[PDB]
Write a protein that binds this ligand. Structure first.
Ligand code: HEM
Length: 137
């Protein structure tokens, strides 16, 4: 289920982080607008770019910690707060996070693997609510 999924993702985190973040940017091409340098690059080009690698792995490092501290796919209010207050997320709305989770869930459904995609879907919906409750627009 959900906890094992965190261990699976963490076991090849750089590849899953890139692959899911690219699924997100390809499903919602308007999202690349929140990152300048990303426009007009193919997936392989993005994976070469130092700042794509180091951003995307930090997103997934922290997202897995938030998942690991959750109870029954409900994240801690402290983790929502942290995500809201980050200077780098100033322009962001709960919509940006919804779309990341929809891509993550569709990635897991299309994989050959026994990911608990329904728990990830609940986790994303609970994280979106937490973010709103913590102050995100
Ligand atoms: C669970 C979801 C997410 C987590 C855990 C997360 C985490 C982080 C972290 C840790 C950083 C700072 C790392 C660094 O700059 O070295 C960061 C920066 C950033 N995040 Fe997020 N993030 C999430 C979702 C999103 C989404 C959905 C967007 C945009 C649609 C986004 C956009 C950014 C941007 C623009 C930055 C800074 C600029 C850059 O990446 O170069 N994040 N995020």
């Amino acid at each position: 289920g959900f906890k094992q999924d965190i261990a699976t993702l963490r076991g090849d985190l750089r590849t899953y982080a890139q692959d899911i973040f690219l699924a997100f940017l390809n499903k919602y091409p308007d999202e690349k607008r929140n990152f300048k340098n990303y426009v007009g690059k193919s997936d392989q080009e993005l994976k070469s770019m130092a700042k794509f690698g180091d951003h995307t792995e930090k997103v997934f490092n922290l997202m897995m910690e938030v998942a690991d501290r959750a109870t029954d796919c409900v994240p801690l209010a402290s983790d929502a707060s942290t995500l809201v207050q980050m200077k780098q997320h100033s322009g962001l709305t709960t919509g940006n996070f919804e779309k990341l989770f929809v891509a993550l869930v569709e990635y897991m459904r299309a994989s050959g693997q026994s990911f608990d995609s329904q728990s990830w879907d609940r986790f994303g919906k609970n994280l979106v609510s937490a973010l709103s409750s913590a102050g995100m627009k």
